[PDB]
Amino acid sequence: PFTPQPAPVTGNTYRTYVNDARTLLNSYGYTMEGKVHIPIDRAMDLIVERGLPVR
């Protein structure tokens, strides 16, 4: 029983969605209806700086 060789996946995959979104989550930019983008791992620093209401 040789190791199976599954057929290659069809063209449509999730990879293009994830690559586009993570690229959007960096490198700033200007959105369509708004003013400016903020990269991820940087807006989180703004959140801990300004803080959220507690209790």
Partner: protein, 54 residues
């Protein structure tokens, strides 16, 4: 030459040789079975009740 044909001298030695080969082949078959992909169910696609595709 009393109770045996002429060829038996060759056959007897060949038989001993064949016996040793058969013995070695026996141990070989035994080890191959206990390490095969059918005995250990290796590279066998087990059918699932719902046919889930990872």
């Amino acid at each position: 030459a009393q109770i045996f044909p002429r060829n038996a001298n060759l056959l007897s030695r060949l038989s001993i040789f064949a016996l040793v080969l058969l013995v070695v082949e026996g141990i070989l078959i035994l080890g191959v079975y206990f390490r095969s992909n059918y005995f250990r169910q290796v590279n066998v696609a087990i059918e699932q009740p719902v046919a889930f595709s990872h």
